[PDB]
Write a protein that binds this ligand. Structure first.
Ligand SMILES: N[C@@H](CCC(=O)N[C@@H](CS(=O)O)C(=O)NCC(=O)O)C(=O)O
Ligand SMILES: [Cl-]
Ligand SMILES: [Zn+2]
Ligand SMILES: [Zn+2]
Length: 215
């Protein structure tokens, strides 16, 4: 199977997670952020992730790909209970996390931004939507405090470092991509239980953390 992604893309990360959790090999391909032609040939419009199944057919939609791959061997892993507290925490943190992440993604060495035009495409589309990146970056100190404090709240909710609610669930697929991308943010104070969850899920999923290029 092949997965066509952006490295920063949280939807893409959800799809990458399930391959890692199931120990199913997959060939990753990072598309340039401005490449409409390639995803359009596969699924009809520019979007990632895109799965190429072992029958060569292409499938879009992270939700569909996650559940397709989880069921492949008739042994689904995503069986644990959902947590309203975790889901509510994610809604709260998603209220502002992109104010930190988008301007940092635009300055980072992800392969989807490896041409100038791709990087400019991202900046032009996301500034229009999120607002002036300079202004967002000038507000970093408050935003970094807010996420450090929110992670202190999450610390008390993590049941096991291998599964947020104790058994692997839909909530791990929603939580880990956010925690992975937040390792790009220099200055966050990571509590112990959250750092262990983040590291264990990075190891299980075989998805890299971003500490080495944090800004
Ligand atoms: N409903 C789809 C959403 C994928 C999506 O919007 N992905 C974004 C990248 S993410 O970093 O925001 C995307 O494909 N953007 C490309 C564009 O809109 O030009 C799914 O669940 O897989
Ligand atoms: Cl899902
Ligand atoms: Zn994106
Ligand atoms: Zn799901």
């Amino acid at each position: 199977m092949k997965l066509y992604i952006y490295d920063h893309c949280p939807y893409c990360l959800k799809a990458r997670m399930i391959f890692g959790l199931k120990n199913i090999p997959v060939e990753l391909h990072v598309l340039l952020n401005d490449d409409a032609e390639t995803p359009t040939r596969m699924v009809g419009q520019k979007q990632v992730p895109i799965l190429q199944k072992d029958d060569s057919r292409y499938m879009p939609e992270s939700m569909d790909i996650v559940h397709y791959v989880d069921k492949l061997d008739g042994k689904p892993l995503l069986t644990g209970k959902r947590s309203p507290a975790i889901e509510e925490w994610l809604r709260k943190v998603n209220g502002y996390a992109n104010k930190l992440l988008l301007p940092r993604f635009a300055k980072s060495a992800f392969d989807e931004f490896s041409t100038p035009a791709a990087r400019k495409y991202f900046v032009d589309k996301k500034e229009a939507s999120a607002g002036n990146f300079a202004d967002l970056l000038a507000h970093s100190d408050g935003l970094i405090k807010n996420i450090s404090d929110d992670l202190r709240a999450l610390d008390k909710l993590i049941v096991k470092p291998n599964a947020v609610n104790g058994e692997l669930s839909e909530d791990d697929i929603q939580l880990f991509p956010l925690l992975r991308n937040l390792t790009l943010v220099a200055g966050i104070n990571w509590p112990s239980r959250v750092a262990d969850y983040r590291d264990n899920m990075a190891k299980q999923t075989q998805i890299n953390l971003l500490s080495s290029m944090a800004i």
